[PDB]
From Swiss-Prot, chain A:
One of its GO terms (cellular component) is cytosolic small ribosomal subunit. Pfam families: Ribosomal_S6e (PF01092). Belongs to the eukaryotic ribosomal protein eS6 family. The keyword Endoplasmic reticulum does not apply. There is a cross-link at residues 116, 131, 149, 214 (Glycyl lysine isopeptide (Lys-Gly) (interchain with G-Cter in ubiquitin)). The gene is RPS6A. The keyword Cytoplasm applies. This is Small ribosomal subunit protein eS6A. Component of the small ribosomal subunit (SSU). Mature yeast ribosomes consist of a small (40S) and a large (60S) subunit. The 40S small subunit contains 1 molecule of ribosomal RNA (18S rRNA) and 33 different proteins (encoded by 57 genes). The large 60S subunit contains 3 rRNA molecules (25S, 5.8S and 5S rRNA) and 46 different proteins (encoded by 81 genes). Interacts with snoRNA U3. uS11 interacts with MPP10. Component of the ribosomal small subunit (SSU) processome composed of at least 40 protein subunits and snoRNA U3. GO terms for biological process: maturation of SSU-rRNA from tricistronic rRNA transcript (SSU-rRNA, 5.8S rRNA, LSU-rRNA); translation.
Curated annotation (Swiss-Prot), chain C:
It comes from Saccharomyces cerevisiae (strain ATCC 204508 / S288c) (Baker's yeast). The gene is UTP20. This is U3 small nucleolar RNA-associated protein 20. It is found in: Cytoplasm; Nucleus, Nucleolus. Involved in nucleolar processing of pre-18S ribosomal RNA and ribosome assembly. Belongs to the UTP20 family. Interacts with snoRNA U3. Interacts with MPP10. Component of the ribosomal small subunit (SSU) processome composed of at least 40 protein subunits and snoRNA U3. The chain holds residues 4 to 227 of 2493 of the full protein.
From Swiss-Prot, chain D:
Residues 1-30 are annotated as: Disordered. It comes from Saccharomyces cerevisiae (strain ATCC 204508 / S288c). Its main location: cytoplasm. Belongs to the eukaryotic ribosomal protein eS8 family. This is Small ribosomal subunit protein eS8A. It is found in: Cytoplasm. It comes from the Eukaryota. The modification Phosphothreonine is found at residues 61, 106. The keyword Cytoplasm applies. GO terms for cellular component: 90S preribosome; cytosol; cytosolic small ribosomal subunit. InterPro entries: Ribosomal_eS8 (IPR001047), Ribosomal_eS8_CS (IPR018283), Ribosomal_protein_eS8_euk (IPR042563), Ribosomal_Se8/biogenesis_NSA2 (IPR022309). The modification Phosphoserine is found at residues 65, 68, 72, 85, 131-132, 135, 138.
From Swiss-Prot, chain E:
InterPro entries: KOW, Rib_uL2_dom2, Ribosomal_eS4, Ribosomal_eS4_C, Ribosomal_eS4_central_region, Ribosomal_eS4_central_sf, Ribosomal_eS4_KOW, Ribosomal_eS4_N. One of its GO terms (biological process) is translation. Gene3D superfamilies: 2.30.30.30, 2.40.50.740, RNA-binding S4 domain (3.10.290.10). It comes from Saccharomyces cerevisiae (strain ATCC 204508 / S288c). Belongs to the eukaryotic ribosomal protein eS4 family. This is Small ribosomal subunit protein eS4A.
Length: 218, 437, 224, 177, 246
RNA sequence: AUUCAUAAUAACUUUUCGAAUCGCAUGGCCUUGUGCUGGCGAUGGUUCAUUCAAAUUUCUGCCCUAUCAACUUUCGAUGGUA
RNA sequence: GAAACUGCGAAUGGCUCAUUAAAUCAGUUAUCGUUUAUUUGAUAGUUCCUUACAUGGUAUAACUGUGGUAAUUCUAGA
């Protein structure tokens, strides 16, 4: 089969073809989310620790956590689940999906590396892929940069240098949830408007009781 | 670094502890860069003209800035020297960094803890998140009973359980349950569920009411009530803004009337101990420090409100104690008089809260007389209660109190209707009787 | 970053300040089939008939009643100038947004017909214009500003020579508008006076520049 | 599967109506929620409109009121005693409306002792109450009628059986024992 | 049909719109609002079909979105807004106010209206209740809720309403001898004085009315609408003044 | 015509709501703080009223068949109570 | 301003006449027997009540990247 392995800390990943039924039998009868040993798999994975994270069988039906059957089943899938994306509101399709217990009939098994062993994997552990996007909320910029509450964010935003032709150029995200004179004005206005509302209501009610009392005194 | 260090403190578990403590102490510690400041020089002028076009303004600004620096060369030498010297201030979060490390390696603290208990017994100032992470560490401790000062830790830990933040309460229960004993083992889940907001009232009526299944036993009740009492104190300190929270506070007080006489008295003792009255009663009636703060005033206000609800729920069966209820009430009303006399009318917020305090305390006295009255003595405290009655009141009692039955006037009328209490009418030159007249 | 890659659609929003910053003043820079320049039985009357057909508003309807009774011919204008002028100024001071385009347009044309005799109204014509412009600030209407400053530009264009001969007084009259504490008042009023100064010849220009610099020392504190 | 139209019924004359249209959602029903005694569990069914409706599957406590002097206290429900529709419901301990349950007394008697200066069992004109209620207090449990719809509001509220009520239900219980 | 309808055919329209039977297949279904479906005039049927200020639906939408039309002082941008009866629609760029009132033939007649008369609006007090917190309110015939009314304002009355403030300037009681406008059934558009109110308990109260030429008719209370006292209407009546002739 | 509208008391609730949102503007004040105030309108939100609807329902009215005269009721047919 | 999330619409329209003989439907009533998105009009200071409001928190999509299946508007792991 094929072993799609990924090192989340570097966030790197590769695929390795596997042939020996010895290590394949190392894999059988384990479930998604169990633990294995890179030693028992092979020599290059000496000291490595994997957790069974997913896969697809020879016909493409992916593994679904939760179904405890090393075969294929028909599940009425609901809105917020995996291996299904609803096309419409409140729509439930009954889909075919492959069980969780690992067997022979699996074509791709997907693993993440939990404990790095003692030897260097070529593409996985050597290299790494940087984050695509940095923080966008005010407090997430603050947490990423460990900033003290005194210091302002708009000097610490992460800009990105893109270039076209000869003109280089920089981009920066809008810091959602930033505290702004506009927002202060809006809050101030809300309060003032509630005050004005209540005063108008009290004036009208006093006036009505005045009219009613005048009537009863006529 | 957080993923590395928990594998090498083992190689060195002394210097790492020293660094941790250095950071813990570090931000509170003063940092000074009092560098050398020379004598000021007033060398500056409008070197160039002022224009409106922006880039001309800019270059003119750069030139003027350089010129100013050179004219005031000396101090600018100092300043450039500083800026190239660079900083030495540790960022303020450094305490939280160290605390998170401490969390990462708890057993080292459990080992030493000698330089940590000073913080706890000073009650930290620190930030709430740091206090929380430190309490998380205390939960992570393994051999907690054998720490440096187990019992003083335990007392401060009960206080944190009495705190009002339910998350702080959860952490304090985690530590107090890290302390191991079979009774609290038996009631672990019950207390945790009592803290949980949804199951709160169901739990109260589940195992707190008497003569039921899953009720607390006798030895168990003796050993566990203080915990229950602190928890209920926090639940009570919940402030009543919405209907649900009003019902929460009312439920706490309405399960109170079934515990036991010493337990209720101890609950009220909690209230007073958060408050304070040995000022007067080490003096006679004189305030040592003019501590007229909103802090102490709202403290008193919460105390009197908790007492008013207590009366309205136990109105005949509840105990009274001079050192836990009677005296602090008197301190409260006396302080209200004092602040109202002492400070002018510019302090609207203080003044209004003081007046509200006076109202509530007087209603409470009237109530407690109505509700226990003849059932115990007063001679020990008749003089003092008469005093705090009569400093401001007998002077203008007739002028002020004539529209509706006031609480104070109701107090006087209870005094009159009850014979054995004639002692106040007696106690002055019938100032009360003359006021009524 | 002003709107520079236009949206495909047809109706954009264009808030008030955007409209004003996009606004400019020069009509000769501008151009179109001007009615008064087109038909020639009298300029005032030409604009007057076009507007009576186009505008349906209370104030201009009243004004049209009175004046259409009075004017129909150039000698009648010349005879009844004062009554017409007082009527125009009365309504302009009424300050009604729906009627101002016709009223100001007729004012410019009224000067065009009455040129070298218009100077005896000139001063308080200008007073009324500046009052209108400040009130327009109060009730923001970029259209009102366009109309008002174009009325000024047209008045200068029609009375080029005499105003040039007595230039400095114009600057004194406009200095409220010129130093006014609003970017666009400064901007537009200066553009109108710009046309006039560019028209002016050398000698009066020297006198003017001297007088204006001494005014600058007068308002040394002011930057506007 | 539970629908409540009147077109599957025999007519008044005893005729039989052939089907008129497919079943409709605006006449549906739903499975009864047999509320039983135990730790609380309450599902929330979503109803026409956006509205909600709290089916109680298991409920333990309740809100019960003493009508005579007019107070209300939260108590615990012990077990169903009698139910005017199904002795099967009595057997199975199913709370519904109009049930007769035995409830814990302690909050009520504590309020009584604290309000009227007198204990129970073993202003006195006002303190005088009914013999049957006094007897139940001595025992520790009261007879109270559940008077809400735990399948519609997720609650057991009730009133304590006073004079004529209690007379009738004691006769019924005693005669059925 | 499994929900509200969003379409209106052309034959199925209210008849008083005078919509030709060939120009299309659909009629403007009036959006929900103050007046009922069948006794409302949408703004497109008023701006295009009656005023002829437009020629299209897209022209009508251009006018509205350019923000010229105000229906009771407030600017309405919905092109099928159900303008109803006794309504005031102002076109300022034309300097016109329109009271929508019925013509003798049944149809809505444009009624040109001056400013001081466009300042207000009559409304048939139709439900007087006691709102939350104990403040009583009146409900008029076009949705409007008005709180703190005069205590002497009873169901079936008229209240003259200042539009600028949503308030009640004054009112008129439903008694015999008042002037009456009629809004339903065979006689709608007919103004007369109210002679008798034959009142049935559990059924429909009928009203006997008498127009100026002393011709008598009988309508329902649902369809009477009190305008003003004898000889003085509070509003300005359309021409012909609601007299049906030969 | 009402146990109506509405109000009040005591409690209860895995408990709701009581604006952490967005556009154009940039005015008023001064203890000169990057302080305090403030304009036009977008969206949303509880509770009633209205509107567009909806669900059930009262009265009367259907073609041929008596060589179909008894029908419906366990298996709800008619009514009572919960 | 593509993508995607969020909101809304998709319950209308259009088509056919199989069923259905007090059913449908027609005229006539009732809701003091009920739900109602929307529209429209009104409508929500609770000052205090003991130990951040210059504005909390964690996720996820599109995207980057590794893949599976003969195949679909299939989709897994990071």
């Amino acid at each position: 089969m094929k072993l799609n392995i990924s090192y989340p800390v570097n966030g790197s990943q590769k695929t390795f073809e596997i042939d020996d039924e010895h290590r394949i039998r190392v894999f059988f009868d384990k479930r998604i989310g169990q633990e294995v040993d890179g030693e028992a798999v092979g020599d290059e994975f000496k000291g490595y620790v994997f957790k069974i994270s997913g896969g697809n069988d020879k016909q493409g039906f992916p593994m679904k956590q939760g179904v405890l059957l090393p075969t294929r089943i028909k599940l009425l899938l609901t809105k917020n689940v995996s291996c299904y994306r609803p096309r419409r509101d409140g729509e439930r399709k009954r889909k075919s999906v492959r069980g969780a217990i690992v067997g022979p009939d699996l074509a791709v098994l997907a693993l993440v590396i939990v404990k790095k062993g003692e030897q260097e994997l070529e593409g996985l552990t050597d290299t790494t892929v940087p984050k695509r996007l940095g923080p966008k909320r005010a407090n997430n910029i603050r947490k990423f940069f460990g900033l003290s509450k005194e210091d302002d964010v708009r000097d610490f935003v992460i800009r990105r240098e893109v270039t076209k032709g000869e003109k280089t150029y920089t981009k920066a995200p809008k810091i959602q949830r930033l505290v702004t004179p506009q927002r202060l004005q809006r809050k101030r206005h809300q309060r003032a408007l509630k005050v004005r509302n209540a005063q108008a209501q009290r004036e009208a009610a006093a006036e009505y009781a005045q009219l009613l009392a005048k009537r009863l005194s006529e | 670094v957080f993923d590395t260090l928990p594998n090498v403190y083992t190689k060195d578990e002394a210097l790492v502890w020293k660094l941790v403590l250095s950071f813990i102490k570090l931000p509170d510690e003063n940092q000074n860069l009092d560098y050398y400041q020379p004598l000021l020089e007033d060398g500056a002028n409008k070197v160039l003209w002022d224009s409106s076009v922006v880039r001309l303004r800019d270059t003119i600004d750069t030139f003027s800035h350089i010129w100013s620096k050179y004219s005031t060369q000396n101090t600018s030498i100092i300043s450039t020297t500083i800026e190239r010297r660079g900083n030495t201030t540790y960022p303020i979060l450094i305490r939280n960094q160290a605390l998170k490390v401490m969390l990462s390696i708890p057993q080292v603290a459990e080992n030493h803890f000698v330089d940590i208990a000073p913080f706890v017994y000073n009650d930290f100032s620190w930030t709430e998140v740091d206090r929380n992470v430190f309490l998380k560490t205390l939960s992570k401790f393994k051999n907690i009973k054998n720490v440096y000062s187990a019992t003083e830790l335990h007392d401060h830990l009960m206080v944190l359980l009495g705190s009002r933040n339910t998350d702080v309460q959860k952490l304090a229960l985690d530590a107090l349950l890290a302390y191991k004993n079979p009774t609290l083992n038996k009631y672990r889940d019950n207390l945790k569920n009592l803290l949980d907001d949804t199951l709160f009232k169901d739990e109260i009526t589940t195992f707190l009411t008497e003569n039921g299944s899953q009720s607390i036993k006798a030895e168990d009740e003796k050993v566990v009530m203080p915990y229950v009492l602190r928890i209920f104190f926090g639940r009570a300190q919940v402030p009543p803004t919405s209907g649900q929270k009003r019902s929460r506070k009312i439920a706490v007080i309405s399960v109170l009337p079934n515990f036991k006489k010493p337990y209720i008295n101890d609950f009220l003792s909690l209230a007073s101990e958060r408050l304070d009255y040995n000022y007067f009663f080490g003096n006679s009636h004189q305030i040592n420090s003019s501590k007229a703060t909103l802090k102490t005033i709202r403290r008193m206000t919460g105390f009197v409100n908790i007492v008013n609800s207590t009366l309205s729920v136990l109105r005949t069966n509840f105990p009274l104690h001079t050192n836990s209820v009677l005296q602090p009430l008197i301190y409260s009303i006396a302080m209200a008089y004092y602040v109202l006399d002492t400070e002018s009318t510019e302090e609207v917020h203080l003044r209004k809260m003081a007046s509200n305090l006076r109202q509530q305390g007087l209603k409470c006295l009237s109530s407690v007389f109505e509700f226990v009255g003849n059932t115990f003595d007063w001679s020990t405290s008749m003089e003092d209660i008469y005093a705090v009655v009569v400093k401001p009141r007998i002077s203008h009692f007739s002028d002020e109190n004539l529209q509706q039955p006031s609480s104070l006037l109701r107090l006087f009328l209870y005094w009159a209707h009850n014979p054995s209490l004639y002692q106040f009418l007696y106690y002055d030159e019938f100032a009360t009787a003359t006021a009524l007249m | 970053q002003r709107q520079t890659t236009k949206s495909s659609k047809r109706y954009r929003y264009s808030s008030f300040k955007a409209r004003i910053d996009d606004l400019k003043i020069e009509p000769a820079r501008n151009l179109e089939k001007r009615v008064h320049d087109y038909v020639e039985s009298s300029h005032f009357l030409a604009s007057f008939d076009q507007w009576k057909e186009i505008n349906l508003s209370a104030k201009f309807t009243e004004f049209a009643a009175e004046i259409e009774h009075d004017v129909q011919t150039l000698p009648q204008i010349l005879y009844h100038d004062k009554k017409i002028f007082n009527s125009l100024v009365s309504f302009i001071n009424f300050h009604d947004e729906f009627s101002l385009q016709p009223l100001l347009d007729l004012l410019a044309q009224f000067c065009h017909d009455l040129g070298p005799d218009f100077l005896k109204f000139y001063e308080e014509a200008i007073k009324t214009l500046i009052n209108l412009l400040d009130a327009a600030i109060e009730f923001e209407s970029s259209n009102v500003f366009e109309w008002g400053f174009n009325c000024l530009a047209y008045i200068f264009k029609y009375l080029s020579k005499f105003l040039v001969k007595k230039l400095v007084l114009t600057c004194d009259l406009l200095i409220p508008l010129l130093s006014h504490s609003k970017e666009y008042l400064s901007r537009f009023s200066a553009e109108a006076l710009s046309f006039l100064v560019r028209k002016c010849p050398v000698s009066n220009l020297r006198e003017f520049v001297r007088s204006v610099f001494e005014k600058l020392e007068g308002d040394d504190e002011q930057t506007n | 599967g539970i629908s409540r139209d009147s077109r599957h019924k025999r007519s008044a004359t005893g005729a039989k109506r052939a089907q008129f249209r497919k079943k409709r959602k605006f006449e549906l029903g739903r499975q009864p929620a047999n509320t039983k005694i135990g730790a609380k569990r309450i599902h929330s069914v979503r109803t026409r409109g956006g509205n909600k409706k709290y089916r109680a599957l298991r409920i333990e406590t309740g809100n019960f009121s003493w009508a005579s002097e007019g107070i209300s206290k939260k108590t615990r429900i012990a077990g169903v005693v009698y139910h005017p529709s199904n002795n099967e419901l009595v057997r199975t301990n199913t709370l519904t409306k109009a049930a007769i349950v035995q409830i814990d007394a302690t909050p009520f008697r504590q309020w009584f002792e604290a309000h009227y200066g007198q204990t129970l069992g073993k202003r006195a004109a006002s303190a005088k109450i009914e013999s049957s209620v006094e007897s139940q207090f001595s025992a520790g449990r009261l007879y109270a009628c559940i008077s809400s719809r735990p399948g519609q509001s997720g609650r057991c509220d009730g009133y304590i059986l006073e004079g004529e009520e209690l007379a009738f239900y004691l006769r019924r219980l005693t005669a059925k024992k | 049909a499994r929900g509200p309808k969003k379409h209106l055919k052309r034959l199925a329209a209210p008849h008083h719109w005078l919509l030709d039977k060939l120009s299309g297949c659909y009629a403007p279904r009036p959006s929900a609002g103050p007046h009922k479906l069948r006794e409302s005039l949408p703004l497109i049927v008023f701006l295009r079909n009656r005023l002829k200020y437009a020629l299209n639906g897209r022209e009508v939408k251009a006018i509205l979105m350019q923000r010229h039309v105000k229906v009771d002082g407030k600017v309405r941008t919905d092109t099928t807004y159900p303008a109803g009866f006794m309504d005031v629609i102002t076109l300022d760029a034309t300097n016109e106010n329109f009271r929508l009132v019925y013509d003798v033939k049944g149809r809505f007649a444009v009624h040109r209206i001056t400013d001081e008369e466009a300042s207000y609006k009559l409304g048939k007090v139709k439900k007087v209740q006691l709102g939350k917190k104990g403040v009583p309110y009146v409900v008029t015939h076009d949705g409007r809720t008005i709180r703190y009314p005069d205590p002497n304002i009873k169901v079936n009355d008229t209240v003259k309403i200042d539009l600028a403030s949503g308030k009640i300037t004054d009112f008129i009681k439903f008694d015999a001898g008042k002037l009456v406008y009629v809004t339903g059934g065979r006689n709608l558009g007919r103004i007369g004085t109210i002679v008798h109110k034959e009142r049935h308990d559990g059924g429909f109260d009928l009203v006997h009315i008498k127009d100026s030429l002393d011709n008598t008719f009988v309508t329902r209370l649902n369809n009477v609408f009190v305008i003003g006292e004898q000889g003085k209407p509070y509003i300005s009546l359309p021409k012909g003044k609601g007299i049906k002739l030969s």
